[PDB]
Write a protein that binds this ligand. Structure first.
Ligand SMILES: Cc1cc2nc3c(=O)[nH]c(=O)nc-3n(C[C@H](O)[C@H](O)[C@H](O)COP(=O)(O)O)c2cc1C
Ligand SMILES: Cc1cc2nc3c(=O)[nH]c(=O)nc-3n(C[C@H](O)[C@H](O)[C@H](O)COP(=O)(O)O)c2cc1C
Lengths: 304, 304
């Protein structure tokens, strides 16, 4: 039995990693993720320069998940590039860098600088399109600019879509770009609103309390997007993100088509130790079913 | 203390009703909803002719809600018109009729026939725009077609939106039609997917297991849409629909700005007695807080 995943020219010890933005902003956080049993790790979505982030409170723990309006707090692209350049131990695990510039041009500039580092160190780009991916002509324009600026393959982080026409429309643009080697589904379900009964107030300060939803709320939506893009993008990898708490949630993600599985809200709560539990629980499900490798049921969700 | 709602020229004993589609397809179900302590009720969304719907199973109970792809099974417009005209006891509570024709014309034709029944009996139309409302010119077209065809005010059932550009776009269109007197937020979060761990297969037969999500999954999305339209459409009523299982849930919908509160998945699981529990629970929250009427906190959600 193995949880290994052989993709992007790398051997990942297991399918698990953090979700971009969770436990990956500071130098100490990246080291904790490297030290952990996760198969990989991704940096916090960075901007060309340092950003303080939205006003606190900007994250709130719900019984069924989370709601947040962080506003891309990050130490700046320079910092994560340098972490990628000469601070990360590639001997432990492969590394993903999330970039999220406010324009096609900002991104393109970061990629031009990332390229030598990626070519030498092997760090992998995940472009956060989550908003751009909700405008299919903006999306094509981003992707064309990046593919012109960036010689290496990369991935894209997508917002959830909620109908087959959008799935088709997005997949069609993605399939025109060979360099996009993976698609991560999903970013938060956007602009939910949480209110406290006692205080009768929203629970986060920015955007009049409207924020991104994660956790148990988003699990069926994440599965749907993973499977929808798995079907429509046979030439790409799909990374699952959303609603993962147990090895069984992981199993379902993989069943729907996920190659890698990102953990957000659960990791935020349980900490880097969760990955040791997640691998054991996944191995458990597989043992109960006689599975020896993820390649044996990835994307093999059945009709009834 | 009172839960009365005075809207649309009617007095409602309380803000609770069923969601369209739940416990409202047969005479028996409609009788049960009328006999219940609900403030109102609404018929199954109907088509000009009877529909048998999608193949079974097309509904499945989730840990935190439901998934379904019913496919609009309904007894046909003639049936619900007859119920509205001849069978419903209006001295018991007001009645809503849901229509969901497949084209603008189908909807226009039904509205032409509903119009005299609405004038004499007082049944109130909810037009199901949920995908049509995800296309703003098609929405504009429908609304204009219906406003031409139908002399009375009506409401519209909306799908969820997930960003402020869409809230602004929809609001702008809705506010251009004075006959649109209420807006129901929300229909199902579209096209989620759930997979059983044991069978490794989807849990509903249609559309490869993709279906609309209901219940606790949709609640923060529901509140967000209720409040977003409450703010942008001050001339209209907002009806809340999504994730109501308790009186506190209803309290939050009202705090977000809901005038009526619709109950779907929870009603499906519990049955019509749920309305006496929901009223008692909502009265309990108001009592702890010293509220005597819903107007004292409707739409009064606080920012930080
Ligand atoms: C506090 C917080 C910060 C996040 N920051 C980012 C980010 O910088 N870039 C990004 O693509 N997603 C970000 N996300 C979204 C996650 O990467 C992921 O898409 C989502 O949380 C999946 O939900 P899950 O918590 O159920 O795993 C953030 C989420 C949270 C809760
Ligand atoms: C089995 C089922 C049938 C439904 N049928 C309709 C329908 O015919 N028309 C409609 O507008 N919404 C329909 N809905 C959606 C509900 O009206 C409601 O929008 C949704 O379930 C969210 O509310 P909830 O969380 O309380 O279930 C249906 C939902 C379910 C679960």
């Amino acid at each position: 039995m193995s949880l290994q995943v052989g993709i992007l020219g790398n051997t990942f010890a297991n399918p698990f990693m953090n979700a971009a933005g969770v436990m990956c902003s500071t130098e100490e956080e990246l080291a904790a993720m490297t030290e952990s049993t996760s198969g990989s790790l991704i940096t916090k979505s960075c901007t060309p320069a340092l950003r303080e982030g939205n006003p606190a409170p900007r994250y709130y723990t719900l019984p069924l998940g989370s709601i947040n309006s962080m506003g891309l707090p990050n130490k700046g692209f320079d910092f994560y590039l340098a972490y990628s350049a000469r601070h990360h131990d590639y001997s432990r695990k492969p590394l993903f860098i999330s970039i999220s510039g406010f324009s096609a041009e900002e991104n393109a500039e970061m990629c031009k600088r990332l390229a030598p580092v990626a070519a030498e160190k092997g760090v992998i780009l995940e472009l956060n399109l989550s908003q751009v991916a909700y405008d299919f002509d903006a999306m094509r324009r981003y992707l064309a600019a990046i593919s012109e600026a960036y010689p290496h393959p990369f991935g894209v982080k997508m917002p959830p879509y909620f109908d087959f026409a959008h799935f088709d429309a997005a997949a069609e643009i993605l399939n025109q770009f060979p360099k996009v080697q993976f698609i991560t589904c999903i970013n938060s379900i956007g602009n939910g609103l949480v209110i406290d009964v006692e205080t009768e107030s929203v629970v986060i300060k920015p955007k009049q309390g409207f924020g991104g939803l994660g956790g148990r709320y988003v699990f069926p939506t994440a599965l749907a997007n993973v499977n929808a893009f798995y079907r429509r993008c046979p030439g790409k990898l799909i990374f699952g993100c959303g609603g993962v708490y147990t090895g069984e949630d992981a199993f379902l993600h993989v069943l729907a088509g996920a190659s890698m599985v990102q953990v957000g809200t659960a990791l935020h709560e349980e900490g880097a130790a969760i990955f040791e539990r997640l691998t054991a629980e996944l191995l458990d499900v597989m043992a109960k079913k006689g599975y020896k490798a993820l390649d044996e049921f990835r994307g093999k969700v059945k009709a009834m």
